[PDB]
Every structure is written in C-alpha cells, then in structure tokens.
From Swiss-Prot:
Assembly behavior: Interacts with nsp8 and nsp12 to form the replication-transcription complex (RTC): nsp12, nsp7, two subunits of nsp8, and up to two subunits of nsp13. Eight copies of nsp7 and eight copies of nsp8 assemble to form a heterohexadecamer dsRNA-encircling ring structure.
Domain annotation RdRp Nsp7 cofactor: ranges: 2-84
Compartment(s) of residence: Host cytoplasm, Host perinuclear region; Host cytoplasm; Host endoplasmic reticulum
Gene symbol of the encoding locus: rep
Range covered out of full length: 3860 to 3942 of 7096
Function of the molecule: Plays a role in viral RNA synthesis. Forms a hexadecamer with nsp8 (8 subunits of each) that may participate in viral replication by acting as a primase. Alternatively, may synthesize substantially longer products than oligonucleotide primers.
Record's protein name: Non-structural protein 7
C-alpha cells in the first residue's frame, strides 16, 4: 500500500462500533461508515451534520445493529453546540 488512510478526528467509539459489526478495514461498507463520519465533520450546520449522523447510523444499523454510534452522534452534536 502506497499510503494508509487516516483522519484527524480519529474516533475509537465509532471505529469500535463497526468492529462489532465485523466489517473489514477495506470493506466498502467499512469505508461508508468512516466516510459518513468524515461527512459529519464536513457538515458546517447542525442540520447538515444531523443528516450525516443518521446516514452514518443508517449504514451501521443496517449492517448488524451495533450500539455505540449514539455516543458519537450525541457527543458530536454536543461539540457542535455552543453558547454563542
């Protein structure tokens, strides 16, 4: 492999939940879950991130139903939330 894929955010809870789904690091679906995570990070609005969060979960839930994405989503949303 010329290079190894990676993200600045680096989520262990999300990655751990797909491991529960038993997807391969190179599986397309594995990529879909990771990509949707990245998409959430790309979302500049709560609504945009929300749609991406459900998309991410849509892949995970559909895959097997592993539980942990809620922690990522609820914490992610918390991060998006601000007093300002």
């Amino acid at each position: 492999g010329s290079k190894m894929s990676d993200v600045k955010c680096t989520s262990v809870v999300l990655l751990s939940v797909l491991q529960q789904l038993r997807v391969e690091s190179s599986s397309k679906l594995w990529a879909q879950c990771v990509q949707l995570h990245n998409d959430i990070l790309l979302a500049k609005d709560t609504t945009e991130a929300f749609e991406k969060m459900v998309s991410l979960l849509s892949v995970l839930l559909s895959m097997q139903g592993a539980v942990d994405i809620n922690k990522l989503c609820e914490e992610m949303l918390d991060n998006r939330a601000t007093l300002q």
